[PDB]
Write an enzyme that holds these catalytic residues in place. Structure first.
Site, PDB file in Angstrom:
ATOM      1  N   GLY A 190       0.822  -1.192   0.000  1.00 22.76           N
ATOM      2  CA  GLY A 190       0.000   0.000   0.000  1.00 22.76           C
ATOM      3  C   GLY A 190       0.859   1.245   0.000  1.00 22.76           C
ATOM      4  O   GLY A 190       2.070   1.193   0.220  1.00 22.76           O
ATOM      5  N   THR A 191       0.207   2.376  -0.255  1.00 19.04           N
ATOM      6  CA  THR A 191       0.907   3.651  -0.292  1.00 19.04           C
ATOM      7  C   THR A 191       1.448   4.006   1.087  1.00 19.04           C
ATOM      8  O   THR A 191       0.784   3.800   2.105  1.00 19.04           O
ATOM      9  CB  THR A 191      -0.028   4.753  -0.783  1.00 19.04           C
ATOM     10  OG1 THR A 191      -0.945   5.101   0.261  1.00 19.04           O
ATOM     11  CG2 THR A 191      -0.809   4.279  -1.997  1.00 19.04           C
ATOM     12  N   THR A 192       2.664   4.543   1.114  1.00 22.11           N
ATOM     13  CA  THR A 192       3.268   4.941   2.376  1.00 22.11           C
ATOM     14  C   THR A 192       2.525   6.128   2.979  1.00 22.11           C
ATOM     15  O   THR A 192       1.992   6.985   2.269  1.00 22.11           O
ATOM     16  CB  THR A 192       4.745   5.283   2.186  1.00 22.11           C
ATOM     17  OG1 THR A 192       5.217   6.018   3.322  1.00 22.11           O
ATOM     18  CG2 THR A 192       4.949   6.106   0.929  1.00 22.11           C
TER      19      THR A 192
ATOM     20  N   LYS B 182      -7.041  11.024   0.986  1.00 19.05           N
ATOM     21  CA  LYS B 182      -6.991   9.833   1.820  1.00 19.05           C
ATOM     22  C   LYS B 182      -6.955  10.128   3.313  1.00 19.05           C
ATOM     23  O   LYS B 182      -7.088   9.192   4.109  1.00 19.05           O
ATOM     24  CB  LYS B 182      -5.772   8.971   1.451  1.00 19.05           C
ATOM     25  CG  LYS B 182      -5.402   9.007  -0.023  1.00 19.05           C
ATOM     26  CD  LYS B 182      -5.271   7.605  -0.596  1.00 19.05           C
ATOM     27  CE  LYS B 182      -4.213   6.794   0.137  1.00 19.05           C
ATOM     28  NZ  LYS B 182      -3.961   5.490  -0.540  1.00 19.05           N
TER      29      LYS B 182
END
Lengths: 233, 243, 205, 244, 242, 243, 144, 241, 250
Positions: free
Chosen positions: B30-32, B62
């Site tokens: 997933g995105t950091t 997000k």
């Protein structure tokens, strides 16, 4: 082929993915091309319907849920009825309780929240249907790309369907072009029709194959079909 | 016997639940997303990955907000975190309805952890595959907790999950060591931008987009809002200066 | 208020000052014409530093006090230490929906190390308010002339107790439904202290 | 997923019979034997309790014969635990019939109620079928004496002489030769005792492991007398039958 | 067995994948859409000559203006037919008008996606999808004569000429070139009889196939045995012409 | 078939395999704790292992105060411990509301053991992964230490050990208890029992403690609280200077 | 594993010999040992220890640009065209693992040869994408 | 409670539970029914494995649903009488709701519907019974004979048989019965039914039960002393010709 | 969500015997060896408390409990299962008799009623059978003293003398000669102590033996005086001091 970890939706692969959702997304890919795009003041949907045989009909791949919103189909037809019904319930609830037309982002959030509860609990199955929500609120024209995984994002344009994603390049090359086009619905629709033509492989666009919808401030959501679409062919 | 990972509530012979481990392994893809506990409040940060340029910039977000003072930033299965933050918002609303006091951060942590573990007790529910860096400011001060899919939460002074999780924590340790007495939010936002840039080096192949947000008492007086205007650009080019 | 059920009435009053808040009541419980218990207590300890008094139907007040005790103990066990507004909140939320059945007036007052002492009153309808002082009960309807003029802000403990006796004397003497001993609670940083008066002294002035 | 642990109790086999009731009909054979003889003057129910020892209590102990109504008594062959719930439901149904009609419940109604209870589990619910089969005896003004039998499948038929339990075939073959249509109670009793002697797995026949239930009609008309033979009277018929 | 509402690597759900091919185990039902009406015909397939022709009814009337045929396993469609009749009559009661054929078909096809275990959010129960495909036919005041195809997959098509069941591939091929927009009801019946004869198992008579019709004035009507016999004679005359 | 080991079903040896595997999950944190029983009070001391420097030491603790009079120390994975803490606090609330008097430790331990037994018997539930040590002072009975388990077998203890080295600490305390023949420590002051427990724990584990390695919970007469770090440092200083 | 019924006690001999050669009394510290397993969840804990194989390099599924690079590399020998959009092909493949792209190239070439074309085009590549993928069944466009 | 689906579409299109119930019926006792001009006869056999079964309290194989319509079954006897109970209560409810005695067609439709629902509902296996419904509609003298399959398909039969060896009885009825020329007398119908039975029962005059249904609320059950009377001349006419 | 295990977990094996029942019997036959015997003037039920760790308190654990002041219970299976069983049985006994009839049910009906729960457990889906075997002793004014043994299958048998546990075979095969028609309470307790002597494997003293007696209505433990109708509870349990007096009486 199916593996041991397929089972039900509530099961994690060792790699860390849900095979149910992946199968739903593949069924999304297998559907027909329904490329859509939006401008600052207009949103255009272009759909390519499919017929079983010569003596057959075409699916209404463009479903209207309100005067300021619209839907597109890229997969399982019957679940689209459930999704459209839920969207219409929430739009009518907004009209009757808030008077505020449902925000497009709020509609996407509601749709993803709905799509979750089948993949989160046993007994449910993911919605193998791909929605391209269009609409226009006080903020501006918006477009979304719903997926069975619950992923919802807003884009200028996209294309979900069989080799439809091969028509994304036409949008990307002209992404800087159709954005600066305002109050020019016919030419934007023409650009959309050019976009879908890149996804054709066997048969060209005809009167009964092109279904087009468009929404805006001066232009409410209207579905074009039959002879009304031949001018844009 | 085999199949100890087919179900959820089954215990492995060594006593470790297996579906939770697979959920953890799904989280890392997933995105950091990092978070810094400055002296007055908290500073979140996300690295939403820019896909094909058709995606509209500065629109998809997000960092979800709970009430006014609790922020939620999530990585991994984004929809699962959407649902988790939805339930958290409902719990905060109920608490404010029947106590008329804003939910304190540890109480929100207890509620979210109890919900998360409720999904790793049965055989008819898939464990959450989302790790959150939710935090904020309350009456007693500031708190920053990372939640893990196993249901374990801790009061971190800084945390990060994503592809560049390991790289981010090293710079978190360096920042903590460099400023043992504490850190101001204004410098914390720039440090968070720098940390995200260092973590993004692993994903340099794809394009990046940075969104940051902070809750504080000195400036935002307990309100959560994003970073807009010249401050975000200043953080961006400060962090790019050292590169 | 039903027919024949036990009611409290009388008078309850709490005054804030520098070192905290002093809350007062009497020991008489008049059931219709008769007086059942003359040494009873109208003071309920929902928390060590949060105190509440009861007025209205005796059973209704006791039940709502027990429910508030349960919720407050839950709050201090799980979330953290309570406060005056939370104590008023649980009382209002308990009283609101069942106002058709539950009909009582509650005054809550607590001392804290941050906002010092505060007094919150719950009338029959169920609203919440913050006041330096508040009165409730049928016997409280007479001292409205005295306390409002004789009230002062940021007083001291001795002056506060002097005012409390000089205000409850008229409540006891002017209404027969209020009587017996006079009970005092002191909420300060030092702690909670219990003080009780006797009928033969505050009457002699 | 809560599927791999399911056994699919109510599932049709490839050839086409149920499998759980199939094994219940095997569990029946492993229980103590029971015998039921239809005589002109009355009905005799006898059963041999299994697992007998010197420490077994016999003074007040009935595990195979149960009373459902003053006129109707039943014999249990199988798992006593599962039979207890059926007995309680049968008693409740009989008392409800007396509530509704204020007249003695005919045996067929109770037999149907119990058969329906068994069938409901054999059909749906995914639960294991009851592994017990009953022997019903009773009297009424409708058909006189009645002697039915039950099965885990929930089917019932009338019988002039039945024996459900261990060595069913041997007992049936032994009784069919000696069965006439004109015995009194004593002839049926001695026939049942001889059958039990010739079908038992032990050597002798001691009074401890035999239970007797008889239906008699004497001077009083319209009401039969239900007597559960206690051990003191049980040891009496042993010398009359000659086994002693 | 494993999963009920489970997907597949090919992305099509199970059950409905099996149900879509379980229709071919049933009879043959054929419909033709003309501007003068729609002609429906079925295949009775008496398993023994001791069966009664008027016994098995594979054609039902949902309404005076709407009727349907049947194919595949017949029993499951009884729930379909009951729900369709209830929907049509309730719409008539609510809106004092006939229900549009497409709307009725939509209100029927939604029931085909209710298979599942432990439905959450509402009480709806179903083990497997229906294995029966229906040919909805009728007339409306806006479009005219319609012929739909109530697939068990929840999707439906407007069809000019369709054959379902055993002849879903053989008879359907001939309908491609044997259909035209100028077709009359009489010639439509003759063509239906000819295609049935081509797909017949035994000799065709008034006892082996049953025909129907829908019209704007006469409405739904089941063809009698005598008219079926004279239609057979007319087809016999037509086939051997040169 | 082979589905026996997956759910709480009996085994050819007459064993419940899932409950057996649940015990192996209690040693994941490898945190060693012990509780002694003083003449008038009780003290429980647990190792406080902070893995990362990013942790805030204050929030990380395996000691939960159930009520103003009953304290509890739990060994195992923390999220399940927090679930058990929530249920125990709620049930203490319910009992105090319904019966009007503060409940003794044995009643709470028995109720939690019954809950765990219901967990084991129901197939769709999984057993709790923790071992709970209930500690309190009962004016009706006296000081008491109660330890339950995932199965539901609870029994009062003169002195409780746990963790990977539970057996070693058990023998270390048993030698003292069998030489002194007394069922409790004769030290009247809660001050002395803390040093007694710390000294025995140090001699057992063979390790030397600092301000942050160990967390001590003290239950006096009608009072339970957790000592701060300065208190533990002062106790360690007193131990070092005394011996 | 412990077993009294029966076991594979022969292979364990080789396993322990390999362990003793990797670390123990003999090192020689000049013999690097690479190992490419596929199921790391099965390996014995001793073989996963330090001193023995230290670096555990994780090989993930290719990134988006990685797929384009793979397609470019494996389409050198074949007579490609000058209008093939590698970016579009790379996006078309989603979670395609390595050799699943070489198979795509081979299938596209085979399709181009079958249809008689003297050089592959983008259409042949897309057809190969559909051929290799989980659409190995394909056909039957029924009900989408 | 139990929500798991038990009837799942097989890859070849059939339902395994229904086609297993077909075989479950195929192991039942043979039951045959024929109809004349104004008489319908339901013939049935009984199991001869065990003896000492009385006649008075033995449940009749042909169960009376109403005064004008009767039902006979084959296959699993346990489940069939549940259908009998449901049919009886539904007939009473129909009398209450429509003020009309039930018709054979409506009752058969209801039985097919309940079997269909059990094939549809989750957690319930399909019925293992196959039923024959015979009777006369009110104010009508026409005998109606209906067969209901566990799959839920119902049809009218001039003469149908179910159970074990039903193929032999079917082929026998296919040549010694004329659909267009039914027997004109009750005696002829009974004789045809009896002669059909000896093709399979092969002795067992004691356990051959026959029910004759007549219009105007007339349902009779011929006793053994009449069945053996018919058997006498039937076997007399068999071997000599 | 709810409970998805609505299917029965006990399935008939093809051999014709219940799996889980024959498995719970095996789980019962291993464990603490308890026993109970019936005498003319009373019933004595005895069990040994296996102190798991010597730092524990066997006093806190109640190996024997009071179903009613007349009826006591002894088990030989799994601890927590017996505890839950005894709590449920006390509750249902109260509900069935104290609420409706006004007094304490006799042993015969109470045993059937408690066995109802276990015979439902082997039937209701999603649950496993109780792993305990119950020894029920009680007295009533009509049927007199009676002792009942409850098996995990739910079947209960009246036994004059019994034993369940590891030493069940030895104790059962040794009790026949010990027992006769006429007996006394002290005779019965001496018999029980002698039988349990060899079956214990740890330290032998008053602390390691749990012993209870149902005898005459003692008024001292009744807790009130003034009602001639009742004379006290018949169920009393010896403490360690009480039992270490007859311990050396061997």
């Amino acid at each position: 082929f199916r593996n041991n970890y397929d089972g039900d939706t509530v099961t994690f692969s060792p790699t860390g993915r849900l095979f149910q959702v992946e199968y739903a997304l593949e069924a999304i890919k297998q559907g027909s091309v329904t490329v859509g795009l939006r401008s600052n003041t207009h949103a255009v949907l272009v759909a390519l319907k499919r017929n079983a045989d010569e003596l057959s009909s075409y699916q209404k791949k463009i479903i209207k849920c309100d005067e300021h919103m619209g839907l597109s189909l890229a997969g399982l037809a019957p679940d689209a009825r459930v999704l459209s019904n839920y969207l219409r319930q929430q739009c009518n609830y907004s009209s009757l309780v808030f008077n505020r037309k449902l925000a497009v982002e709020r509609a996407g959030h509601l749709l993803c929240d709905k799509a979750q509860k089948n993949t989160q609990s046993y007994g449910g199955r993911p919605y193998g249907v791909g929605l391209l929500i269009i609409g226009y609120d006080k903020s501006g024209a918006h477009l979304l790309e719903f997926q069975p995984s619950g992923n919802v994002t807003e884009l200028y344009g996209t294309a979900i369907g069989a080799r439809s994603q091969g028509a994304k390049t036409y949008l990307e090359r002209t992404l800087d072009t159709f954005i600066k086009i305002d109050g020019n619905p016919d030419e934007l629709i023409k650009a959309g029709v050019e976009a879908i033509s890149q996804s054709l492989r066997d048969e060209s666009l005809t009167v009964d194959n092109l279904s087009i919808a468009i929404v805006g401030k001066d232009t409410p959501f209207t579905i074009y079909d039959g002879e009304a679409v031949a001018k844009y062919i | 016997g085999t199949g100890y990972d087919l179900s959820n509530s089954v215990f492995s012979p060594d006593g470790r639940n297996f579906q939770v481990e697979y959920a953890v392994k799904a989280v890392e893809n997933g995105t950091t997303s990092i978070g810094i506990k400055c002296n007055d409040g908290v500073v979140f940060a996300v690295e939403k990955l820019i896909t094909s340029k058709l995606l509209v910039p500065q629109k998809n977000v997000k960092i979800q907000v709970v009430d006014r003072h609790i922020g939620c930033v999530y990585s991994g299965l984004i929809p699962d975190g959407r649902h988790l933050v939805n339930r958290g918002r409902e719990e905060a609303a109920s608490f404010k309805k029947l106590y008329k006091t804003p939910i304190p951060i540890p109480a929100f942590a207890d509620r979210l952890g109890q919900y998360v573990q409720a999904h790793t007790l049965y055989n008819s529910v898939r464990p959450f595959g989302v790790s959150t860096i939710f935090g904020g400011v309350d009456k007693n001060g500031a708190h920053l907790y990372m939640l893990e899919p196993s249901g374990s939460y801790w009061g971190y002074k800084g945390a990060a999950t994503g592809k560049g999780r390991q790289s981010a924590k090293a710079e978190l340790e360096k920042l903590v060591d460099h400023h043992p007495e504490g850190l101001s939010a204004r410098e914390a936002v720039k440090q968070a931008a720098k940390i995200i840039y260092l973590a993004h080096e692993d994903n340099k192949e794809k394009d990046f987009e940075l969104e940051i947000s902070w809750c504080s008492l000195s400036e935002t007086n307990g309100l959560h809002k994003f970073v807009k205007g010249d401050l975000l650009q200043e953080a961006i080019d400060f962090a790019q200066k050292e590169i | 208020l039903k027919k024949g059920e036990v009611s409290l009435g009388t008078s309850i009053m709490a005054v804030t000052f520098k070192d905290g808040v002093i809350l007062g009541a009497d020991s008489r419980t008049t059931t219709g014409a008769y007086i059942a218990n003359r040494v009873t207590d109208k003071l309920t300890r929902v928390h060590d530093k949060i105190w509440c008094c009861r007025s209205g139907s005796a059973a209704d007040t006791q039940a709502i006090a027990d429910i508030v005790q349960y919720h407050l103990e839950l709050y201090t066990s799980q979330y953290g230490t309570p406060s005056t507004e939370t104590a008023a909140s649980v009382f209002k939320e308990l009283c609101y929906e069942n106002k058709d059945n539950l009909t009582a007036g509650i005054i809550v007052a607590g001392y804290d190390d941050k906002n010092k002492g505060e007094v919150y009153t719950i009338p029959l309808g169920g609203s919440v308010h913050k006041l330096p002082y508040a009165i409730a009960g049928s016997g409280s309807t007479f001292i409205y002339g005295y306390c409002d003029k004789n009230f002062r802000e940021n007083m001291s403990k001795e002056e506060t107790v002097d005012f409390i006796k000089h205000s409850l004397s008229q409540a006891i003497k002017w209404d027969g439904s209020s009587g017996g001993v006079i009970r005092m609670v002191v909420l300060t940083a030092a702690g909670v202290e219990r003080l009780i008066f006797y009928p033969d002294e505050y009457e002699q002035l | 997923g809560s599927r791999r642990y399911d056994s699919r109790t109510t599932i049709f086999s490839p050839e086409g019979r149920l499998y759980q009731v199939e094994y219940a009909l095997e569990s029946i054979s492993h229980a103590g034997t029971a015998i039921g003889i239809m005589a002109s003057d009355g009905i005799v129910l006898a059963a041999e309790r299994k697992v007998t020892s010197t420490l077994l209590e016999q003074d007040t102990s009935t595990e195979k014969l149960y009373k459902l109504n003053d006129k109707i008594a039943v014999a249990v062959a199988g798992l006593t635990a599962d039979a207890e719930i059926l007995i309680n439901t049968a008693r409740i149904h009989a008392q409800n019939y007396l509530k509704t009609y204020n007249e003695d419940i005919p045996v067929e109604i109770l037999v149907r109620r119990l058969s329906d209870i068994k069938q409901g589990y054999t059909q749906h619910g995914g639960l294991r079928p009851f592994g017990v089969s009953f022997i019903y005896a009773g009297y009424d003004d409708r058909y006189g004496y009645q002697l039915y039998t039950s099965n885990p499948s929930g089917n019932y038929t009338g019988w002039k002489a039945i024996s459900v339990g261990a060595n069913t075939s041997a007992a049936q073959t032994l009784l069919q030769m000696d069965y006439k249509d004109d015995m009194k109670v004593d002839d049926a009793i001695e026939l049942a005792l001889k059958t039990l002697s010739k079908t038992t797995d032990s050597s002798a026949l001691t009074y401890d492991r035999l239970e007797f239930a008889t239906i008699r009609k004497g001077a009083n008309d319209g009401e039969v007398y239900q007597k559960i033979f206690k051990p003191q009277e049980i040891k009496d018929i042993l010398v009359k039958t000659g086994i002693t | 067995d494993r999963g009920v509402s489970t997907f597949s690597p090919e992305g099509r759900l199970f059950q409905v994948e099996y149900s879509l091919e379980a229709i071919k185990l049933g009879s043959t039902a054929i419909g033709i859409a003309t501007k003068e009406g729609v002609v429906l015909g079925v295949e009775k397939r008496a398993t023994s000559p001791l069966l009664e022709s008027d016994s098995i009814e594979k054609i039902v009337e949902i309404d005076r203006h709407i009727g349907c045929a049947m194919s595949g396993l017949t029993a499951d469609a009884r729930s379909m037919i009951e729900h369709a009749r209830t929907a049509a009559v309730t719409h008539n009661l609510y809106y004092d008008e006939d229900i549009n054929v497409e709307s009725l078909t939509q209100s029927v096809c939604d029931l085909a996606l209710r298979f599942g275990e432990g439905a959450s959010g509402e009480e709806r129960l179903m083990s497997r999808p229906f294995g029966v495909a229906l040919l909805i036919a009728g007339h409306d005041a806006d479009d005219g004569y319609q012929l739909f195809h109530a697939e068990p997959s929840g999707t439906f098509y407007r069809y000019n000429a369709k054959a379902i069941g055993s002849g879903s591939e053989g008879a359907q091929a001939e309908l491609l070139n044997e259909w035209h927009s100028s077709l009359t009801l009489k010639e439509a019946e003759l063509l239906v009889l000819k295609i049935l004869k081509q797909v017949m198992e035994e000799k065709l008579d008034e006892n082996n196939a049953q025909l129907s019709c829908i019209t704007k004035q006469d409405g739904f009507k089941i063809y009698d045995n005598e008219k079926t016999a004279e239609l057979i004679k007319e087809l016999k005359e037509k086939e051997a012409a040169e | 078939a082979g589905y026996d080991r997956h759910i709480t079903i009996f085994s050819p040896e007459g064993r419940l395999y899932q409950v057996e595997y649940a015990f192996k999950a209690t040693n994941q944190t490898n945190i060693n704790s012990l509780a002694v029983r003083g003449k008038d009070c009780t003290v429980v001391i647990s190792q406080k292992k902070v893995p990362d420097k990013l942790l805030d030491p204050t929030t990380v603790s395996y000691i939960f105060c159930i009520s103003r009079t009953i304290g509890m120390v739990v060994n195992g994975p923390i999220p399940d411990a927090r679930n058990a803490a929530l249920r125990a606090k709620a049930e203490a609330a319910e009992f105090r509301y319904k019966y009007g008097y503060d409940m003794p430790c044995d009643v709470l331990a028995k109720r939690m053991a019954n809950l765990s037994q219901i967990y084991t018997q129901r197939a769709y539930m999984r057993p709790l992964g923790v071992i709970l040590t209930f500690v309190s002072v009962d004016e009706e009975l006296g000081p008491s230490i109660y330890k339950t388990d995932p199965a539901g077998y609870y029994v009062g203890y003169k002195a409780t050990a746990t963790g990977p080295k539970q057996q070693e600490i058990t023998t270390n305390l048993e030698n003292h208890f069998k030489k002194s023949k007394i069922d409790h420590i004769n030290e009247e002051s809660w001050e002395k029992v803390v040093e007694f427990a710390i000294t025995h724990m140090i001699d057992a584990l063979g390790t030397e403690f600092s301000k942050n390695d160990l967390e001590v919970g003290v239950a006096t007469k009608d009072k339970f609280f957790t000592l701060s770090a300065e208190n533990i440092e002062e106790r360690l200083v007193a131990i070092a200077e005394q011996d | 594993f412990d077993s009294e019924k029966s076991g594979d006690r022969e292979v364990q001999r080789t396993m322990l010999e390999l362990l003793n050669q990797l670390d123990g009394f003999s090192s020689d510290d000049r013999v690097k040992v690479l190992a490419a397993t596929n199921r790391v969840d099965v390996l014995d804990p001793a073989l996963l220890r330090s001193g023995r194989l230290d670096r555990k390099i994780e090989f993930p599924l290719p990134s988006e640009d990685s797929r384009a690079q793979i397609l470019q590399i494996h389409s050198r020998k074949m007579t490609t065209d000058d209008d093939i959009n590698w970016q579009e092909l790379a996006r078309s493949t989603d979670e395609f693992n390595g050799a699943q792209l070489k198979a795509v190239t081979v299938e596209a070439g085979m399709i181009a040869l079958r249809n008689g074309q003297s050089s592959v085009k983008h259409e042949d590549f897309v057809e190969g994408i559909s051929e290799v993928q989980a659409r190995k069944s394909k056909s039957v466009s029924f009900y989408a | 409670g139990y929500d798991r689906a038990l009837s799942i579409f097989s890859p070849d299109g059939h339902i395994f539970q229904v086609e297993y119930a077909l075989e479950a019926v195929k192991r039942g006792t043979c039951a045959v029914g024929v109809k004349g001009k104004n008489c319908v006869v339901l013939g049935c056999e009984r199991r001869s494995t065990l003896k000492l079964q009385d006649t008075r309290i033995t449940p009749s194989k042909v169960s009376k649903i109403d005064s004008h319509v009767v039902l006979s079954f084959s296959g699993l006897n346990a489940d069939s009488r549940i259908l009998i109970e449901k049919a009886r209560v539904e007939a009473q409810s129909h009398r209450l709701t429509l003020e009309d005695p039930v018709t054979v067609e409506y009752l058969t439709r209801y039985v097919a519907g309940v079997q269909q629902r059990y094939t549809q509902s989750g957690g319930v296996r399909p019925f293992g019974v196959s039923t024959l419904i015979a009777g006369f509609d009110p104010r009508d003298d026409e005998p109606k004979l209906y067969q209901t399959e566990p799959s839920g398909i119902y049809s009218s039969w001039s003469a149908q048989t179910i159970g074990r060896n039903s193929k032999t009885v079917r082929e026998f009825l296919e040549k010694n019965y004329d659909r267009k020329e039914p027997p004109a007398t009750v005696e002829e119908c009974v004789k045809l039914t009896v002669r059909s039975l000896l093709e399979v029962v092969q002795t067992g005059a004691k356990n051959i039960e026959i029910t004759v249904v007549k219009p105007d609320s007339d349902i009779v059950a011929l006793s053994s002393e009449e069945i053996n009377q018919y058997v006498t001349q039937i076997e007399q006419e068999k071997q000599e010709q | 969500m709810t409970d998805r295990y609505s299917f029965s977990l006990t399935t008939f094996s093809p051999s014709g015997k219940l799996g889980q029942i024959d498995y719970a019997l095996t789980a019962v036959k291993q464990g603490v060896t308890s026993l109970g015997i019936k005498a003319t003037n009373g019933v004595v039920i005895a069990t040994e408390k296996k102190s798991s760790s010597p730092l524990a308190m066997s006093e806190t654990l109640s190996k024997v409990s009071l179903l009613t002041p007349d009826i006591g219970a002894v088990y030989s299976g799994m601890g927590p299962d017996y505890r839950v069983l005894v709590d449920k049985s006390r509750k249902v006994a109260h509900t069935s008799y104290k609420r409706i009839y006004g007094e304490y049910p006799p042993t015969k009906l109470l045993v059937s009623e408690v066995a109802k729960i276990m015979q439902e457990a082997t039937q209701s889906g999603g649950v496993r059978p109780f792993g305990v075997s119950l020894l029920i002793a009680g007295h009533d004014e009509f049927n007199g003293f009676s002792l009942y043994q409850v098996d995990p299958s739910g079947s209960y048998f009246p036994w004059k003398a019994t034993a369940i546990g590891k030493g069940s075979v030895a104790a059962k095969t040794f009790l026949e000669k010990r027992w006769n028609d006429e007996l006394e309470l002290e005779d019965a307790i001496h018999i029980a102590l002698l039988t349990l002597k060899e079956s214990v494997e740890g330290e032998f003293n008053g602390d390691t033996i749990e012993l209870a007696i149902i005898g005459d209505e003692n008024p001292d433990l009744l807790g009130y005086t003034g009602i001639p109708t009742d004379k006290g509870p018949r169920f009393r349990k010896l403490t360690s001091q009480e039992i270490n007096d007859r311990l050396e009486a061997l």
